[PDB]
Structure formats: C-alpha cells, structure tokens
Design a protein around this ligand. Sequence first.
Ligand SMILES: [Ca+2]
Ligand SMILES: [Ca+2]
Lengths: 141, 65
Amino acid sequence: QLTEEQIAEFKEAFSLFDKDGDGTITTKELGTVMRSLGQNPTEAELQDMINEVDADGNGTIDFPEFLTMMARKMDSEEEIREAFRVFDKDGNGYISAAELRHVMTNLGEKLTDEEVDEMIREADIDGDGQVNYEELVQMMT
Amino acid sequence: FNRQIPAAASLIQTAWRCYAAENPDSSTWKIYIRISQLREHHRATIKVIRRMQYFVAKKKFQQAR
Ligand SMILES: [Ca+2]
Ligand SMILES: [Ca+2]
C-alpha cells in the first residue's frame, strides 16, 4: 500500500523544510528548522542526517528522497534488540527499571524521567521493576 | 571503552522517541521547552527530524560493530 493522503501530508512536511521552494532540502535549511525548535545541532549532525536520506549522494534531499525516508517501516528489530543486549548484564532478557532509567537519562540522547516512565510503564508485565525489553522491541515494531 | 555503549543507547532512545511521537499526548513532547505552545506545524517537522535521527543512530550502531 502506497498511501495518497500521506503524500499530501508529506508534501506539506517537505515544504516546512524547503523554505526556498527550489524542491531541495539543504543542511542550512535543516538546521534552520532544528534551531527554531530550540535545538543547537552541529554540521556533523546535519550532514549525517542528510547523508542518511540523500540516496543519490548529491548532498541535498529532494522530495522523492523525502518520500522514501517517510515511506520506510521498521527487520530493524534485531538491531534494536542487540542494542538492548549491550545493557542486559545478566543476559536474562531483562533490565532493571533503575538501570534502564540510569542509562537512558545519562547516555546518548538523555531521555527525561517521564519519557523513561513511559517505557517502564509500557513493558513491566510483572510490576516488580524488571523491564522485559523484548516487549519494547515489539511495541515499537 | 566500548564505543557500542553510547551508540546502543542512542539507537534505543531515538527509536523510542520516534515511536512515542505517534502519540500526540506522550510525555516525549514536553521536552521542547523553548516553544510557548506546540502547533501542528511544529509536530510535522519534529516527526521528520526524529525519523532522521533514528536513521543516523541506526547507522552509527552498525558502524561501531
Ligand atoms: Ca531549498
Ligand atoms: Ca538528493
């Protein structure tokens, strides 16, 4: 299924990034949007974001490349699963809510406590603080 | 000391933040402090930005391995 209401929404979404109207998203325009939202990204971050979507390597993002990027779904579930394993010390398939919150809020992108709560509230099964992270891999996919 | 530990974290957070954003009422929306009120044009660009960040965090994880 290749939706059509979605193409419209994506058209509108592309426009917010392509201030020009020249049919192209450049890193400058992408940092313009991010900075307006309160983010201070580095051009290494901006270029990495363009590189992931710029499928023809010409250094910018045109609308069909945008479409591809939005049109993707998530198997990326084994990479996420492997990501969790890096923190499953016991190899049990579990991470303690205390350890989850600790690595989530202090490494990488640094989630907020409420954000982490939503994770814990979503995948506890047993209400004893043992986060079944296969349930998360499953919820996000 | 394990370049995978930071990358694995960023893959989970960005994947989660990408998933959580489909809920308009998730607490993951509360982080944009410097916005006086989230309009729906903010949400469109945030969804796009968060999908890009996940792709970057996806690739960075595979590279550390
Ligand atoms: Ca442009
Ligand atoms: Ca291009």
